[PDB]
Amino acid sequence: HVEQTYLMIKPDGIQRQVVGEIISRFEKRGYRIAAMKLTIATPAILEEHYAEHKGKPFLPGLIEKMTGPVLCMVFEGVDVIAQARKMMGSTRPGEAAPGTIRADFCQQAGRNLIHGSDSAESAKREISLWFKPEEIQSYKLALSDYIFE
Amino acid sequence: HVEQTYLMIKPDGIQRQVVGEIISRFEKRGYRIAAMKLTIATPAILEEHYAEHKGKPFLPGLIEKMTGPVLCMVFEGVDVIAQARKMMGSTRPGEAAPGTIRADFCQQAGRNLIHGSDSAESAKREISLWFKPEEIQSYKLALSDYIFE
Amino acid sequence: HVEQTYLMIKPDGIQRQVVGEIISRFEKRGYRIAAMKLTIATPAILEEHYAEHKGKPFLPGLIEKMTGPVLCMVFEGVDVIAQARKMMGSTRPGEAAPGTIRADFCQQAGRNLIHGSDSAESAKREISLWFKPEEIQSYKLALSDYIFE
Ligand SMILES: Cc1cn([C@H]2C[C@H](O)[C@@H](COP(=O)(O)O)O2)c(=O)[nH]c1=O
């Protein structure tokens, strides 16, 4: 069975103009784009996005870094929630494995280019926060027979 | 002291049209193309290719996935049998390291893009199965002095 | 706090004509080019560079391999000394992780494409040996707000 994960290119990904490169990494595995939207993230939606960190001293700083243009995305694939995390790499780019997004593009955790859901529960919540159901698109990849066993 | 390994692009590599990208990964290390042939794999040759799994319940499914166009290849280099295995990554793409072929391109073991010999004995057997001696080409890379110590 | 490291493309990197690819890997992380110079390495400068190995039987062959065009470089970034070492990978390419320069381009330690400082002390020593201070340039990257936290 496939699943869907929420991936969001942060303002540093937009401003460094690596959006296409990021998308290509997920397309390369035959992951399907199920939703995609450019918006400007605001403090009120980011408070909900970062709800697990309510009341923590670092939350204002997380929100400030994220206040800016973002690319909201939903990708579909086998085990894609865990696999996208593996592809992003460790929170700290300096600890991330070579070949991951954060190791290949970044230096510090506060500017680590991309967010991805950390669990099935978070993916469901995040997809619902940033997308309406009518924005989630269902279609089948023509190469499905050569992607899925 | 170089050796030769058998590498085969499976039908999913052909149909997803990533043959050139795969070849480029091996050329990038200064591995030498010693043989290359496009064919359509037959059940008869695949039964011998997969002889280790004779009688196993999953063998018919393995053969069915592989009955299609394939690119047979022989690459030469230092430690190239083990090194090509490392470059392909784990059989299951989800367990493969970022930066390997299977992690970068694939989702499931049954569609994992590429075969490579797993040992010196297997390489000798597989090269002999898929190639005639007259198809194996001997020449020296002009950059040899800058590739080999 | 950023630091600076000495990175040198060896004659195999020049002759295999992958200079631009190497530079792009470091630029991709927002590391700043603080110095860059093409020269031809000579035995007298290489003897100082490899001073720790004076008298060892492998040194004459090492110096022979390194007598040729080289690209001297200084890159600046957070933790860049350790990070550049990680990006190069193990001295022996066969042991280097997928996604590192040496794993992606090389076969043997004697032709492993690139040198990088192993410590802050070595970086200071190597930058003094290979560059004049006139050659180290001070300027700020315009994307700093999106590279550094
Ligand atoms: C941006 C950032 C996030 N994180 C943590 C906060 C969340 O628990 C997790 C995912 O954050 P993210 O949604 O901003 O990618 O990473 C840090 O520890 N340091 C940072 O600098």
Ligand SMILES: Cc1cn([C@H]2C[C@H](O)[C@@H](COP(=O)(O)O)O2)c(=O)[nH]c1=O
């Ligand atoms: C295709 C496939 C191969 N394998 C095993 C069978 C062989 O022992 C080994 C290499 O197979 P391969 O020649 O098809 O790459 O991988 C699996 O365990 N699962 C799979 O889905």
Ligand SMILES: Cc1cn([C@H]2C[C@H](O)[C@@H](COP(=O)(O)O)O2)c(=O)[nH]c1=O
């Ligand atoms: C080129 C080379 C370097 N080295 C060691 C010597 C130095 O301690 C370290 C870095 O050397 P380098 O300046 O040539 O990169 O690598 C080997 O052990 N084997 C080799 O073939």
